[PDB]
Every structure is written in structure tokens, then in C-alpha cells.
């Protein structure tokens, strides 16, 4: 379900509590796995900017909690290399929640969204106010 | 899914350690839906029945309705049928009798 993305550095292992970017009621998301990750003995699977992860709500509305639902990383604090040359990194991690088809439940996203996340997912680029 | 039973006891295995026996009605149906891997998430139950197909073929078919929830206010009921391959092994309690250490 995921299109082609150039490799960027892995900055969110399993267990990372990242912020929640949209206004769907949640406050933070707890990454438990990454769609399309690999397999190695004692290696933790990790997420990057633009990956689809499975994530649970630890704080927010009581309707959303205690169930697993997929989500999309939109910001990242670990620096990655763009092909034009500059190394960039945001201030904090963030994630919006979505269905497994990729459509977003949220209405609008606060703060900026990474550019390589906007090209990879169409519905994220609709809700995005600021793209980098 | 898979159900283990004994060919010398004819007695079904509950997955932790137990050995609830077989009536194929009203008590065998109870153990067989805990193994159904469905979760209590969205069914809570609707109705369950099984199909006759064959006595000696090691497959038991069950059909069940769910009555789950899809949208914010939509309760909805659908149905489907599951086919359990039944795997034969030993009862350690009743493979013990072949060792002459029977009484204890």
C-alpha cells in the first residue's frame, strides 16, 4: 500500500511516544510496529518520516484508547539527508492517525509536515497547512 | 485453527492444560469459541452452530454470526463459517497406561 520512498535515517524505535499532530482527540501515539520493516535477531524495528506504523493512544479521548489503529509519521527529530544536500531535522516527533487504506480521520494538522511525507501520501497533503 | 485430541481417550484439549471431554453439543461448543482467535473486541456474540460434514474426516466446521459495530453508531450483523483441522496426539494421562506405572 506504500509507494516508493528514498531511504532516510531510522529515528523512532518500538516504544517511542510521539506527539499527535491532528485534532482527532488524541494527544500522543505509542508506536508498536512499523509496516514493511524487516527481520533480524534482537533488532528493534524502527520508523522514519513517512512510514505507516501501528500506534495506540495513551492519552486523549476515552473513545480512542485501548485499541490498535494505524498511523503516519509527519515530523522527526533525528536528522536525515536530503538529496539536494541539506541535513534537516524538526523539533519533535509527530503522528497523524489513519485507516489502513491511508485516508486520514483528522480535519487539519497543526505545525509543519515533512515534505517526503507529503509526496508519499495524498490525503496528508490535503490536510497539510505548512509543508516544510 | 487447530484442535488437539487423544486417539485413546477421545477427549479434547483446552489449550492451557485441561482436558474437557467431548459432547459435540452445548459444552464442546463453549471451549471451541475461546480458540476462535476473534477477540471480544467486536462481536460479544450473536449465534453459533456447527455443520455435520463427516465423522472420520478430521475437520469440524462451525458457522457463527457476530453482531459487531462498524461506524460510530452502526450495529451490524454478518455471518461466516470456519473450518477447524483436528490434529490427533496422545493423552499423557492415558498414554501412561502403556508403561505399567498406572496406579500412582
Amino acid at each position: 500500500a506504500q509507494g516508493t520512498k528514498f531511504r532516510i535515517s531510522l529515528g523512532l524505535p518500538v516504544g517511542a511516544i510521539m506527539n499527535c499532530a491532528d485534532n482527532s482527540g488524541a494527544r500522543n501515539l505509542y508506536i508498536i510496529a512499523v509496516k514493511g520493516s524487516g527481520s533480524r535477531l534482537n533488532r528493534l524495528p524502527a520508523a522514519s518520516l513517512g512510514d505507516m506504523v501501528m500506534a495506540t493512544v495513551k492519552k486523549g479521548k476515552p473513545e480512542l484508547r485501548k485499541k490498535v489503529m494505524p498511523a503516519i509519521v509527519v515530523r522527526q527529530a533525528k536528522s536525515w539527508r536530503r538529496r539536494d544536500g541539506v541535513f534537516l531535522y524538526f523539533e519533535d516527533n509527530a503522528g497523524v492517525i489513519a485507516n489502513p487504506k491511508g485516508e486520514m480521520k483528522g480535519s487539519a494538522i497543526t505545525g509543519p509536515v515533512g515534505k517526503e511525507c507529503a509526496d508519499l501520501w495524498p490525503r496528508v497533503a490535503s490536510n497539510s497547512g505548512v509543508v516544510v | 485453527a487447530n484442535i488437539s485430541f487423544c486417539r485413546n481417550c477421545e477427549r479434547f484439549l483446552q489449550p492451557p492444560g485441561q482436558w474437557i471431554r467431548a459432547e459435540l453439543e452445548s459444552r464442546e461448543l463453549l471451549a471451541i469459541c475461546l480458540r476462535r482467535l476473534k477477540g471480544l473486541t467486536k462481536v460479544r456474540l450473536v449465534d453459533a452452530s456447527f455443520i455435520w460434514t463427516e465423522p472420520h474426516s478430521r475437520r469440524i466446521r462451525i458457522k457463527l454470526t457476530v453482531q459487531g459495530e462498524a461506524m460510530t453508531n452502526t450495529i451490524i450483523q454478518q455471518t461466516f463459517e470456519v473450518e477447524y483441522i483436528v490434529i490427533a496426539m496422545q493423552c499423557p494421562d492415558c498414554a501412561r497406561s502403556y508403561t505399567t506405572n498406572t496406579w500412582r
Binding site: 516508493t4 528514498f6 533480524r40 535477531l41 534482537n42 538529496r83 539536494d84 544536500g85 509526496d119 | -
Partner: protein, 384 residues
Amino acid sequence: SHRKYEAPRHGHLGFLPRKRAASIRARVKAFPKDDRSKPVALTSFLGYKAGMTTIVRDLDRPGSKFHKREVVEAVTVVDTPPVVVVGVVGYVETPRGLRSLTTVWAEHLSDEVKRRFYKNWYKSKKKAFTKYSAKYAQDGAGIERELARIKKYASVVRVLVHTQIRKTPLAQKKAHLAEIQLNGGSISEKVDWAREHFEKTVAVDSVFEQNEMIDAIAVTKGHGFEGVTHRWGTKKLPRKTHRGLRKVACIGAWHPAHVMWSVARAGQRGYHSRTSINHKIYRVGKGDDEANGATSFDRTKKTITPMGGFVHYGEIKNDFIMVKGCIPGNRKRIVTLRKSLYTNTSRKALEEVSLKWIDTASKFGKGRFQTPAEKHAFMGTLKK
């Protein structure tokens, strides 16, 4: 008992033994396949790696996401002085392999090649090639018999060349000698090529052209006796281990009661011979030009030597080859460049590149100016 968690192997088994190489010049194991319909040229070359710098080019690759986009990329600059031929050597074929038959050296030899034949030059009477040079001094019948021996017999022909070390900022005065096989046609013609090129220079641009896939053969950077974790990439033990944690726990089972050849063990790391393939040539610059660093999109007069020179090497004021990505072997190392063994097609060989900009800032750390002509325009008038 079985293994209880499958995991792929640490290390590669086709690169054993990790022992020190026999010499700093790594040998070319295999030369490309000859095609005798084509004219005579060389098949490999010698040079000295200097350093690395950054490049920017417009990527032209259809169906990609970065199409017609600037990409920064890492290149190496190998200092490549002109190489002069001193002799030819012809090989006949046996059932036991290829056997050397006759090597014919030229008349005059420089002082650089004579350094190779001696271990104590200053005490030596410098008597190498004195009785050989008297053969040319007469009518020359002793040598025309020898090249006619190679024309009749001798399936393949190599050519002994050597680098010019005086045109290079190394402190070494001794030249490096090597064989290079020719891949022209009709081996009576190969030896007539080398006959005319005795004590004649061979430039770089005649051998290699731009946008060509080549290989790189040299001796790896050495590191000395290293431990089993950094040598193979094996797992560190936990913190609570008595007497060591940077080790490998189980050497092997009971049976067989011998340490197997496949387990990981500490030893020599580095200074191996490696062949790396598929490195793409970006720029073949000449020596007598102040525009080595210039580009059609840059239009500034500078050489590719950075501000303050390359670290540990010096000044590139010669011909050079600028090839994409890292090369095995550190700086100052004698490096062989070989043509590709097979014709490549896929998409990446046939692509032609034109640069945007060459990075010439100081490599000696956190450099922020490209040329000292424009450092003075930024900071202005200083005290000194």
C-alpha cells in the same frame, strides 16, 4: 540441541584468510578479454590516490523522483602522472598455464627505475643494466633476435611500465614497476607498438575517457591486530560477564573436538588486497590548465587543489582522474585502475554527466571559503 533462533552469519567466507598483503601494490588478477579487431591500447593504469571532494551534478534518470535535479555526491581524486614504458614481455601457453618467455628492456633507463632494483642506493655502485645496455650500443642484432622470438611464439604480450614519482609530492624517490597487458590485434602488431614506445610517455586521456565504468584495485588501509567484535561485527556480551565482554562466547560444540575454520577470531585487520568494481569516471583533467576546478556553470578560474592543499598529500599539479564514490586503500597509496571486464548496459553505465560545481574548500577542517581570492573580499582589509 538445535539453534533456537535462526540468524544470518557474521562475516564473509570468500575473503579468507585475513592476512597482510605481500606488497603495497596489489596485483591485477585478471585482464579483460581481448578483441583483436580493435586497435592497440593499454588496459590498466597506475596512480596515487590523493583525497576526496564533493561534487554537484544534474541527475538525468527517467522514471525517478529526482529527475533533472541537483544531487551532491562524493568523489575521489587520484593523482595520475604520465607513465613511461621501459620494456615488453611475452607469454607462451602451456598445459600447466601461461609461462613467461622473454622480457626485453629498453636501452636507457631513468634513475627512478634503478631505485627499485637496489635496497641501498647510496652505497651502491649503480651497476644495474650496464652490460645490458651494450647490446643496443652495437648494431643491435642481439635484440632483433629477441623481439622476433616474441613475434613467432608468445600468445599474449604484456608491457612493463612505471610511474614518474618526481612529478608527485610524495617524499619517496623510488618508482613503482608493473605489468600491463595489451588488447590490440595480431600480436606481431602489439610488439611493434611497444617497440616504438620505449622511453616514451603515455598520457592518461588516451587510455580512459569520461563516463566510463572502471574498477579500482589497491591495498586496503591497515589497522593492526584487532579484536573479534570490530573485525567481524559480532555481538557484544552482556555487562555482567566475568573476565571480558568484547568476545565470542561459544567457540564450538564438543564434537568435532577442533576449533572450526569458520568461527570468528581476532587477528590482522586491514592491509588486504581488494578489487572493487563499477566506479564511474566523471572528469579527466589535464595538468597544464588553471581551470581544473572550473565548470561551464561555474566559470571561475581555480584548480581542484583546495585551499591549503589536500590533507597529507599536497598539490595535484599533474593529470588526474575523478571517479565516483570511495576507492579501497587510503591516501598516498599506489592504486591501479583497470578497465571493466564486461560490457555494461543497464542504465547507469550509459548515462552522461556534466558537473555543476566542484568543492574546493579547505579539507583541513570546517572550511568556509572556496578560493583565497574571495576570502579577502569577504573579510576585507585585515591588520597583516
